[PDB]
Ligand binder design. Sequence first.
Ligand SMILES: CCOP(=O)(COc1ccc(C[C@H](NC(=O)O[C@H]2CO[C@H]3OCC[C@H]32)[C@H](O)CN(CC(CC)CC)S(=O)(=O)c2ccc(OC)cc2)cc1)OCC
Lengths: 99, 99
Amino acid sequence: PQITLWKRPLVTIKIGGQLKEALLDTGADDTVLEEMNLPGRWKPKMIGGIGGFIKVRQYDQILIEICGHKAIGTVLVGPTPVNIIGRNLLTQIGCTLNF
Amino acid sequence: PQITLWKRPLVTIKIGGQLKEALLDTGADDTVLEEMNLPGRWKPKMIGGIGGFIKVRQYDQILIEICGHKAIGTVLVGPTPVNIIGRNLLTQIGCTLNF
Ligand SMILES: CCOP(=O)(COc1ccc(C[C@H](NC(=O)O[C@H]2CO[C@H]3OCC[C@H]32)[C@H](O)CN(CC(CC)CC)S(=O)(=O)c2ccc(OC)cc2)cc1)OCC
């Protein structure tokens, strides 16, 4: 679809068999989801934002479906204020900015 | 134009008579610019992201030219690590997400 930005670009995603709402975030290098139980191994990582850095759990090669489009890649889980879909997965679903 | 997301969506902007590089950021409700001394009144504000909140100065009705497209709206100024163009101005230049 084509998504205007008068409202937050929130979409439904499916990860680990569960549905959630997430923000398509072109300003995010990586995809960061709120605390949740994902299967598989993970490694600790740190990522920084406007307010500073947080500790996250890095899950690699995770299947995630974003508004009906499948992606497989890195998903970070931690105390983000909002579930964000970042460029690492936006590229996989073929997302571009247009004006 | 169309902007792919393999790399950060950095574009040239012109504000307050100065040229700068800024991120087109669909995850940002508002526009946050690096420290700069702009004339006129302002109001204190706090904005939060990953890592917590930062203190910024809110200036209203500021003109910004983004890749030749003019926009005028609220601009927040503070110790952001990056110039961020948020939805308040992206809507005005007709920016959409597409996949
Ligand atoms: C190389 C730069 O240095 P740093 O690492 C950090 O620089 C930055 C800082 C911010 C951003 C943009 C930010 N992205 C982000 O957090 O991305 C994370 C995930 O992927 C990583 O990619 C780069 C950072 C990592 C979001 O798009 C926008 N945000 C909202 C969003 C937060 C989840 C929804 C609530 S917002 O900015 O907080 C914001 C809140 C309210 C507003 O209006 C009221 C306007 C803006 C990009 C690079 O310095 C460390 C100290």
